[PDB]
Amino acid sequence: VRVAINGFGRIGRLVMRIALSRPNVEVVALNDPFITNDYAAYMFKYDSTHGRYAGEVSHDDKHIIVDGKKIATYQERDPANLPWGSSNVDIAIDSTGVFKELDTAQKHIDAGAKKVVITAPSSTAPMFVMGVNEEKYTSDLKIVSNASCTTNCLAPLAKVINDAFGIEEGLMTTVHSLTATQKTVDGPSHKDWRGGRTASGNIIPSSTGAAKAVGKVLPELQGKLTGMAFRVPTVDVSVVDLTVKLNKETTYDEIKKVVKAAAEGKLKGVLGYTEDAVVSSDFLGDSHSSIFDASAGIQLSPKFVKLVSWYDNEYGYSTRVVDLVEHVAKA
């Protein structure tokens, strides 16, 4: 599979790290109109959260070069002007968050790419979550979306719980690490007043659609889940706090066994399970979409339970993007 990456923010860079480790993926090009090759090489190489790239990174006038792989770079504002066809690009991966609808992402196809994978939720493009609805993908679909990181954490667990005990209703809280939209000291954030306030000295309440977005990937849960978020001053790794009213009576011990079986079975690698005394930093660079915290969870009555699942909001999601990429080309 020959891929190009559009955008070089958190998602863009990490998708590149992971893609470069996939033997069947070839990373042909990178587009980012707002950085030069030396800066791109720098940004890729040093990471405050995930460490130094273990390998040699450098650049010339037309490439970022990593361990012998030259990756051509482009500085195009309009993705239509990109030489994807001429470069024979199987899949364009859009990590910019501004080409995320069927008509806007279409520009990569126009430019020559065969398919597009979008690294944000979409209104128009069909959404997929590995281990949730990937079978529902079909080869004629040219533009898909990988949903969101919080969605990738909630959906796989929610499916497991609903299939096994039924979800009548659920209210979710995500305790979320800092993100790039936040400010270092109280600053302007016109659409999201709270999100403008000093990131590292606040618990910051935030609205999030990810809980209803489970509705789109699992239609059987439409309108049964919503939630909210608290942004806290950790730099990465977030956790889902799911308060769910069940349909069938069950022990907590039974929930544990069902989830663990799913972790070891069909959801291996997407959904994880632990019983150990873990904290957020224990999940830095973990590639699971969702890691179930068995000890942190608490059951009140036999149909009323609180489930806790971790996710590295940057790395898990980025691995899923690459998973979706390989899956979509396998078709």
Side-chain angles (χ1 to χ4, degrees), residues 161-202:
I161 304 303
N162 190 55
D163 290 353
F165 318 100
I167 288 153
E168 183 191 291
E169 277 195 304
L171 279 161
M172 184 208 71
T173 297
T174 172
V175 191
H176 205 287
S177 276
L178 301 182
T179 59
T181 58
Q182 288 184 257
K183 309 300 176 206
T184 51
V185 298
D186 283 355
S189 173
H190 312 88
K191 298 155 290 207
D192 174 16
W193 288 9
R194 306 205 210 212
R197 305 279 306 276
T198 309
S200 71
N202 288 300

Side-chain angles (χ1 to χ4, degrees), residues 154 158-159 161-172 209-216 218-227 242-248 304:
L154 180 60
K159 178 187 198 170
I161 304 303
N162 190 55
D163 290 353
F165 318 100
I167 288 153
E168 183 191 291
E169 277 195 304
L171 279 161
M172 184 208 71
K212 306 168 84 168
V214 172
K216 324 263 295 173
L218 292 158
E220 67 263 54
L221 285 174
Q222 175 84 29
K224 283 161 150 200
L225 292 178
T226 191
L242 177 65
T243 309
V244 63
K245 290 157 74 186
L246 302 170
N247 281 141
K248 291 155 170 281
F304 194 46

Side-chain angles (χ1 to χ4, degrees), residues 6 30-38 40 60-64 71-79 81-84:
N6 190 31
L30 162 73
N31 183 60
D32 195 314
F34 300 125
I35 56 174
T36 64
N37 293 155
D38 63 335
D60 65 30
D61 296 345
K62 302 214 67 46
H63 305 85
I64 293 299
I71 299 167
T73 58
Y74 305 96
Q75 288 78 12
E76 301 294 337
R77 258 146 257 87
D78 189 324
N81 304 333
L82 286 159
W84 294 160

Side-chain angles (χ1 to χ4, degrees), residues 15 28 33 43-44 60 110 118 120 131 148 156 160 192 202 229 236 243 245 271 276 299 320:
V15 152
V28 178
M43 285 190 100
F44 179 73
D60 65 30
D110 293 348
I118 302 164
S148 77
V160 163
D192 174 16
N202 288 300
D236 187 39
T243 309
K245 290 157 74 186
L271 166 79
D276 286 352
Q299 175 136 32
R320 289 306 87 75

